[PDB]
Each structure stands twice: as C-alpha cells, then as structure tokens.
Design an enzyme around this catalytic site. Structure first.
Site, PDB file in Angstrom:
ATOM      1  N   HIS A 224      84.771   1.301  52.147  1.00 44.85           N
ATOM      2  CA  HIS A 224      84.789   0.447  53.347  1.00 44.85           C
ATOM      3  C   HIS A 224      84.981   1.212  54.638  1.00 44.85           C
ATOM      4  CE1 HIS A 224      89.089   0.660  52.585  1.00 44.85           C
ATOM      5  NE2 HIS A 224      89.304   0.223  53.836  1.00 44.85           N
ATOM      6  N   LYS A 228      84.293   6.011  59.561  1.00 45.02           N
ATOM      7  CA  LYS A 228      85.230   6.894  60.232  1.00 45.02           C
ATOM      8  C   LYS A 228      84.700   8.309  60.448  1.00 45.02           C
ATOM      9  CE  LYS A 228      89.563   4.453  59.135  1.00 45.02           C
ATOM     10  NZ  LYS A 228      91.040   4.609  58.904  1.00 45.02           N
ATOM     11  N   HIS A 279      84.782  -6.039  56.674  1.00 41.96           N
ATOM     12  CA  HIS A 279      86.175  -6.102  56.269  1.00 41.96           C
ATOM     13  C   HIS A 279      87.212  -6.179  57.379  1.00 41.96           C
ATOM     14  CE1 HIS A 279      85.661  -1.884  57.142  1.00 41.96           C
ATOM     15  NE2 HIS A 279      86.978  -1.676  57.016  1.00 41.96           N
ATOM     16  N   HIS A 280      86.782  -6.146  58.642  1.00 44.07           N
ATOM     17  CA  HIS A 280      87.683  -6.451  59.771  1.00 44.07           C
ATOM     18  C   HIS A 280      87.346  -7.737  60.426  1.00 44.07           C
ATOM     19  CE1 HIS A 280      89.938  -2.724  59.691  1.00 44.07           C
ATOM     20  NE2 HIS A 280      88.767  -2.055  59.542  1.00 44.07           N
TER      21      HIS A 280
HETATM   22  N1  C2E Z   1      99.698  -8.113  60.833  1.00 44.26           N
HETATM   23  C1  C2E Z   1      99.726  -6.803  60.470  1.00 44.26           C
HETATM   24  N2  C2E Z   1      98.583  -6.239  59.959  1.00 44.26           N
HETATM   25  C2  C2E Z   1      98.561  -4.922  59.580  1.00 44.26           C
HETATM   26  C3  C2E Z   1      99.786  -4.097  59.727  1.00 44.26           C
HETATM   27  N3  C2E Z   1      99.484  -2.851  59.285  1.00 44.26           N
HETATM   28  C4  C2E Z   1      98.178  -2.871  58.899  1.00 44.26           C
HETATM   29  N4  C2E Z   1      97.629  -4.097  59.072  1.00 44.26           N
HETATM   30  C5  C2E Z   1      96.238  -4.541  58.736  1.00 44.26           C
HETATM   31  O1  C2E Z   1      95.474  -3.651  57.903  1.00 44.26           O
HETATM   32  C6  C2E Z   1      94.172  -3.406  58.441  1.00 44.26           C
HETATM   33  C7  C2E Z   1      93.835  -1.938  58.183  1.00 44.26           C
HETATM   34  O2  C2E Z   1      95.031  -1.192  58.496  1.00 44.26           O
HETATM   35  P1  C2E Z   1      95.278   0.394  58.252  1.00 44.26           P
HETATM   36  O3  C2E Z   1      95.134   0.614  56.760  1.00 44.26           O
HETATM   37  O4  C2E Z   1      96.564   0.848  58.916  1.00 44.26           O
HETATM   38  O5  C2E Z   1      94.044   1.049  59.093  1.00 44.26           O
HETATM   39  C8  C2E Z   1      94.030   0.963  60.531  1.00 44.26           C
HETATM   40  C9  C2E Z   1      94.567   2.217  61.194  1.00 44.26           C
HETATM   41  O6  C2E Z   1      94.233   3.390  60.453  1.00 44.26           O
HETATM   42  C10 C2E Z   1      93.858   2.207  62.541  1.00 44.26           C
HETATM   43  N5  C2E Z   1      94.823   1.750  63.585  1.00 44.26           N
HETATM   44  C11 C2E Z   1      95.191   0.485  63.914  1.00 44.26           C
HETATM   45  N6  C2E Z   1      96.113   0.493  64.925  1.00 44.26           N
HETATM   46  C12 C2E Z   1      96.357   1.785  65.263  1.00 44.26           C
HETATM   47  C13 C2E Z   1      97.203   2.536  66.249  1.00 44.26           C
HETATM   48  O7  C2E Z   1      97.960   1.967  67.070  1.00 44.26           O
HETATM   49  N7  C2E Z   1      97.118   3.888  66.226  1.00 44.26           N
HETATM   50  C14 C2E Z   1      96.308   4.595  65.374  1.00 44.26           C
HETATM   51  N8  C2E Z   1      96.276   5.958  65.417  1.00 44.26           N
HETATM   52  N9  C2E Z   1      95.510   3.974  64.458  1.00 44.26           N
HETATM   53  C15 C2E Z   1      95.499   2.606  64.364  1.00 44.26           C
HETATM   54  O8  C2E Z   1      92.717   1.340  62.475  1.00 44.26           O
HETATM   55  C16 C2E Z   1      92.652   0.759  61.170  1.00 44.26           C
HETATM   56  C17 C2E Z   1      92.233  -0.695  61.295  1.00 44.26           C
HETATM   57  O9  C2E Z   1      93.329  -1.491  61.746  1.00 44.26           O
HETATM   58  P2  C2E Z   1      93.133  -3.051  62.150  1.00 44.26           P
HETATM   59  O10 C2E Z   1      91.758  -3.241  62.764  1.00 44.26           O
HETATM   60  O11 C2E Z   1      94.348  -3.454  62.956  1.00 44.26           O
HETATM   61  O12 C2E Z   1      93.228  -3.878  60.744  1.00 44.26           O
HETATM   62  C18 C2E Z   1      94.387  -3.709  59.919  1.00 44.26           C
HETATM   63  C19 C2E Z   1      95.446  -4.806  59.987  1.00 44.26           C
HETATM   64  O13 C2E Z   1      94.987  -6.157  59.880  1.00 44.26           O
HETATM   65  C20 C2E Z   1     100.990  -4.784  60.287  1.00 44.26           C
HETATM   66  O14 C2E Z   1     102.059  -4.137  60.430  1.00 44.26           O
HETATM   67  N10 C2E Z   1     100.886  -6.101  60.622  1.00 44.26           N
HETATM   68 FE    FE Z   2      88.494  -0.335  58.344  1.00 43.13          FE
END
Ligand code: C2E
Ligand code: FE
Ligand code: FE
Ligand code: FE
Ligand code: FE
Lengths: 363, 361
Positions: A224, A228, A279-280
């Site tokens: 998925h 990246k 998936h988002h």
């Molecule tokens: N409600 C809630 N949901 C959570 C939380 N942690 C993860 N998720 C969910 O998991 C999806 C993928 O998260 P990931 O594996 O951290 O994978 C993430 C992460 O690697 C990156 N990412 C997101 N926010 C940040 C950030 O502030 N800084 C950095 N460096 N990367 C980020 O982008 C990817 C996609 O994130 P999203 O589009 O947000 O979509 C997220 C989100 O819906 C949480 O604490 N609360």
């Molecule tokens: Fe993703």
C-alpha cells in the site's frame, strides 16, 4: 453383476482429488488410500527423504506427526539405497523385517512390496510400500508393474506439490522484501508490511470473500505504501510536523503507488493499485486524495484503512505509546461509519483477539 | 488386462501433473480420452469471457481456434449443460460437416459433455468422436466420460491457477523493480530485457531449467538499492564528485540488504546479483573488487546483459552501437570486465540478444 471399469473410475476420482489438493500431507494420504484400493492391499506407506535430518520419514495416521525411519535398515531402507524392488512373499522368513509394530498391535504382516520413487532426474527420493495383498497370497509380477506406475504418479504429484509451495513462498518473499525498499528513508519495519496483509486477510475471509480474493488482499495490501519511493527526501525524512506544502506532497504517495502498480494485467496488481490509491480515503468522504465516499471506495481499500490504522495505533510512534486492546476497541467503536466501513468494523471487532495475536507474535 | 487402462491412465496423469503449459495439458487430456474411451478423436473446448466464444487447440499447439459458442454441437452442450450423444453425425441438423470436408475425416459418432468449475458453472465441453467399435457411445461410455471430464476440470483449473500465479509473480517483480521510476530514467523495458538476455545466456551456459527461470526473474532487480540513495546525489543536476560517487556505489550494498535473508532461492540469487553486478572479472570493480569466480555466475551473466542493453540504446548525441561495434567491444572486454567463457557463449548468441532488443523496444 460386476463393473468392468470400476477401478479405472476409482482412479480418475482419486486423481481429481489429488489435483486440487495443495497440501502435501493430504496428497500423501490420498496417494496411500489410492494404492491400498488399486493394489488390493491392506496397508500402504510413502517414505520421503530429508536432506537436513538425513533420514526417511512417513506419516502413520491421518493428522499426526512425522515418524523418522532409519534410511539404512529395514525393507524401505534397502529399496531406498539400492534402487531396486523388494517383493517379500513372507515377511517373517526375512531378517530385514522388524516385528515390533507387529508385537504390539493385533496385526500380522505377511506380504510386503516396496518400490523406489524417482525425481525427474532419476534420483531416488523415497520409497512406496504396500502390505498384505488381500485377493491373493503374494504380490505378482503384474502387481509390481502396477506399483511402478503408481510410483511414477506419486513422484510427479509429490514434486508438483512441493514446487507450487516453493513458488508460492517466493512470491510472498518478493512482495514483502521489495515492498520494504523504502526502508532506508522510512522507520516502518518489515513486519508492519507483512502484518497489514495478515489483518486484511482475516477481514476478507470473514466478510465472506472468495478464497482467491482472500489470498489477494493478503498479498496486495502490503504494497500500500509503495508510492513513498516517489516522495522527496526533505519531506519523507523530516521528523515531527509538516507544513501545508509538504503534507500536500506527502499525501501524493497514494497517487504514486497507483502509478507504480496500475500497469500490470494480473488481478493481484489491479487490487494492489487500488489499495495504494485508496487506503487513506474514508467512509465519510473526507479522506484524501479524492474524498471518495462509502461504496465508491473498493472493498479492498476499505479493508486496508482498517488494517493500516490498527497496526499504527498498536505500535509506539514518536511521543505515543502503543494502544492496548481496550482503547483500540473504543477508537474503532467510535470511528465506525466515520473513518471506516461500519460492516467491516464490526467484523474487525469480532476478530480483534486474532489481530492482537498476530501483532504479538510478529514483533 | 484390464490393468492396461490403469497403467495408461497413470502414465498420462504423471505427464499432466508436471506439465505447466495449459496447451500441453489439453493435449495430454485429449490423448487420454482417446485411449481410455477407445475412440478416434477428442477435443476439449474452453470459454473465453473476453471474446465470448469457445476455443480449442489442435495438435502441434498451433494458434487456438475460435468456435461459435451458440450454435454447433459444443455450443449446445455449453449453453444447455445437457449431454449430447449422436449415433450418426450426418443425420444431425446441428453438426457442421466442414472439418470433415477439409481434413477428409468422416465423423460418425460424437459424444459431448460439459465441463464444470468448483462453483459449478459450465466452463467448456469435452467431446469424443468416432468410437472404435463403429457403433454408438453406450451409457457405460457416457458414465466413463463424466468421470474423465471431472479429471479434466481439475487438472485444467489447477493449471490455469498455476499460470495466474506465474504471471502475477512476474508482474510484481517487474513493476516493483521499476519503482525507482520517479527518481531515475531507467525504463520498464530495460528491466525486463536484462533478465531476458540473462535467461538465454543461462540456458546456453548449461544451467538447469529451474536456474534459468530464476535468473530471468532475479536479474531484473539488480538496481533496487537505488531507492536508498539520498536525493542530494541521485538527483544532483551536475556530474558527481568523488564523495558523492562513493555513495552512489552503495546501491549495490543497499540492494543486498533489501533482498537478502529471504529464505527462498530467488531472493538469494537476486541479493547476490544486486551486490555483484558492478564487480569486474579482473577484480577492478566495486564495491569489494571480487575477482573471477568469487563473483557468482548469476552476477557475471547480469554484468554482461546490462552492458549489452546500454550499448544498444540511443541517448542524445550517442547512437546505439550496431552488431559489429558491440561484438568488438565484448571481445576487447573478455577477461577484463567480463568472464571469458561466458562472453563466448554470449557472442554465439548475440543475434538472439538483438532480437529481444528489437521486439521489446
Ligand atoms: N486518529 C489517529 N490516527 C492515527 C494515529 N496514528 C496513526 N494513525 C492513522 O494511521 C494512518 C497511517 O499512519 P502511519 O502508519 O503513522 O503512517 C503515516 C506517517 O508515516 C506519516 N505521517 C502522518 N503524520 C505525520 C507527521 O506529523 N510527521 C511525519 N514525519 N510523518 C507523518 O504519513 C502516514 C499517513 O498518515 P495519515 O494520512 O494521518 O493516516 C494515518 C492515521 O489515520 C493516531 O494517533 N490517531
Ligand atoms: Fe499510506
Ligand atoms: Fe544501473
Ligand atoms: Fe547498478
Ligand atoms: Fe541497468
């Protein structure tokens, strides 16, 4: 009155069963059952070789574990090493026979016929053995011919079962390892990639999808985040918060994924491409890139949201300890019909123990 | 006797369990039907969801023949699912007598049954022609055929399954190896062709057919480690300096790390090709300067195929080398960049290389 083609049909029937069986355990079973019937023998045994433990082995009953068999002794052993047929008219007038199974259970072994099994390149890979001919006092010249032909089929289907497993295993390893190419520039472990598929497998399975789509998500879902690779370093490596020029780029990994994957013709890659771009998305219609709503998301994307979010929440990330079951349950219960498909959420909740046992068992 | 027919069937069924090509499976099945049913001809018909017709292959595996799915005899069995037993084809309105008219065959008896998939859809027709008694197909005959048809469905479905697995395994290796495509000019077809050249090379080099298949699929991942190279280098709009060049070289190590440890043979070979493909036979390559047979053979084959592909591709101001130019190059590189024994084999087959390079443009 009697049926002239009776055995021919029995044999067709075994041959259909064996051709559908992917499990070596059951192939060995069906093969022995087949030989018992066609040879008119009380018992049969297939013996195969283990390179690593340097012995022969066999399965005695349906559904219980390998028995080691000494490659160098007994009837099986002799056949295995020399390459030639043993036809014992009476087993008790023969030194190579161990009367010890015989001592204990209420069973007398009289006739033994044993032939080798060859691979495609004429190496002896094991022995096929039948015991106690029922409709005669000995195994005949024709019985030997017949078993030689059976040994030929046993070999082919055995090897083909092993080769399909090797290819199935390779195909997985390749999706796992290549899916993790992003690893030099992303913290995500190998096991994240694997586990996301494992969850989505359970989901598809319990939502009642065809067995083939179950195997598909299991292998499509892990790809998925492939997009990246197309994200600039300055954006993918930056720790903490992202501005709103940077986030707009980071979101684009969904479109990149589609680009990388949409080109294939296999069903795997049509599914993987959809998952990557979807998936988002969110059941509400709020989530990126396009704000697709409910059924406009493919079911494979829908299963992957759930799995992706589950796996993230249950791992330590910057400043957040991984969620326990209770919180995660509370969170999905909350997001039912919001972030997620409501139907799939229920299924996921019914099955949450397994999700966690996957998570615990794969570090 | 009558163990004769069992021994025949085991023989055919052994051939079928090995056969990975569908067309061969259909051939074996129809030859089995002929010997088992004591009949003169046999055809299998499958359905194409796409062209919306049945098709069949004749012997020699020439191009498959479209058959009209609605009318005709196979068409009837296909559409209705009922069994058709004709005692005399030439008294039947549904028979098409042109196969007879061209071959000089005389079709008398025809028996046709449907084929079913597990979900129990009709997926085709099994047809047996001209029983060798010159008389009719009997109920005991129909009954043997229902069983044969059952085995054919199984072996077919299994073989189509194996092919889907093969085809998707390739697609994934190819598409994912081209994942560097947003940050690197190398084309999808470059990646495929490198494996095709290595294939021919491995075959003509003596390797087991299973290793030939492996190199065909491992070699295209040689450059995967490029993913790990910092943008400040891979995307630098200049020529690189030596500090940057050393980091580029590392895509070989990055590749090995990405690929190794996989339990299966395919990934062991890929990881080796990835770390080895910039090594040179004389030990002047990178990253380790392995010499001669310290470089695995799969590495040696890929070095060759990769250079081949580069020399024969136009870039601006630099027209691709033609055959003569290229051969001179490999001769001059024998024992330097490349394994001599392997270059010779490569040279014996260079026309095949240009053929590949010509069709997969
Ligand atoms: N409600 C809630 N949901 C959570 C939380 N942690 C993860 N998720 C969910 O998991 C999806 C993928 O998260 P990931 O594996 O951290 O994978 C993430 C992460 O690697 C990156 N990412 C997101 N926010 C940040 C950030 O502030 N800084 C950095 N460096 N990367 C980020 O982008 C990817 C996609 O994130 P999203 O589009 O947000 O979509 C997220 C989100 O819906 C949480 O604490 N609360
Ligand atoms: Fe993703
Ligand atoms: Fe390169
Ligand atoms: Fe390279
Ligand atoms: Fe290259």
């Amino acid at each position: 009155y009697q049926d002239p083609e009776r055995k021919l049909k029995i044999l067709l029937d075994y041959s259909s069963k064996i051709a559908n069986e992917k499990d070596l355990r059951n192939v060995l079973l069906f093969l022995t059952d087949l030989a018992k019937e066609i040879m008119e023998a009380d018992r049969a045994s297939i013996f195969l070789y283990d390179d690593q433990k340097k012995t022969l082995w066999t399965i005695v009953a349906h559904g219980v574990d390998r028995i080691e068999i000494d490659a160098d002794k007994g009837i099986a052993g002799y056949v295995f090493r020399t390459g030639e047929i043993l036809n014992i008219p009476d087993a008790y007038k023969d030194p190579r026979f161990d009367r010890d199974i015989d001592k204990r259970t209420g069973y007398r072994t009289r006739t033994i016929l044993a032939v080798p099994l060859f691979d495609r390149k004429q190496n002896i890979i094991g022995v096929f053995q039948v015991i106690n001919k029922l409709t005669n006092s000995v195994f005949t010249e024709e019985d030997i011919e017949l078993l030689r032909h059976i040994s030929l089929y046993a070999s082919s289907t055995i090897e083909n079962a092993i080769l399909y497993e090797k290819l199935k295993k390779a195909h997985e390893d390749v999706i796992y390892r290549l899916s993790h190419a992003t690893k030099f520039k992303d913290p995500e472990t190998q096991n994240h990639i694997i586990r996301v598929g494992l969850y989505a497998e359970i989901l598809a399975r319990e939502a009642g999808l065809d067995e083939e789509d179950v195997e598909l998500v299991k292998l499509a879902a892990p790809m998925h985040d492939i997009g990246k690779v197309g994200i600039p370093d300055r954006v993918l490596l930056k720790p903490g918060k992202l501005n709103d020029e940077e986030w707009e780029i980071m979101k684009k990994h969904t479109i990149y994924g589609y680009e990388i994957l949409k080109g294939g013709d296999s069903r795997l890659l049509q599914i993987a491409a959809d998952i990557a771009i979807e998936h988002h998305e969110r059941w509400d219609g709020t989530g990126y890139p396009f704000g697709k709503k409910g059924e406009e998301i493919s079911i494979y994307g829908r299963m992957t949201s759930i799995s992706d979010v589950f796996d993230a929440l249950t791992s330590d990330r910057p400043y957040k300890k991984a969620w326990d079951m209770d919180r995660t349950v509370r969170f999905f219960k909350e997001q039912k019909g919001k972030h997620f498909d409501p139907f799939l959420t229920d299924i996921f909740l019914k099955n949450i123990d397994q999700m966690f046992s996957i998570k615990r068992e794969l570090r």
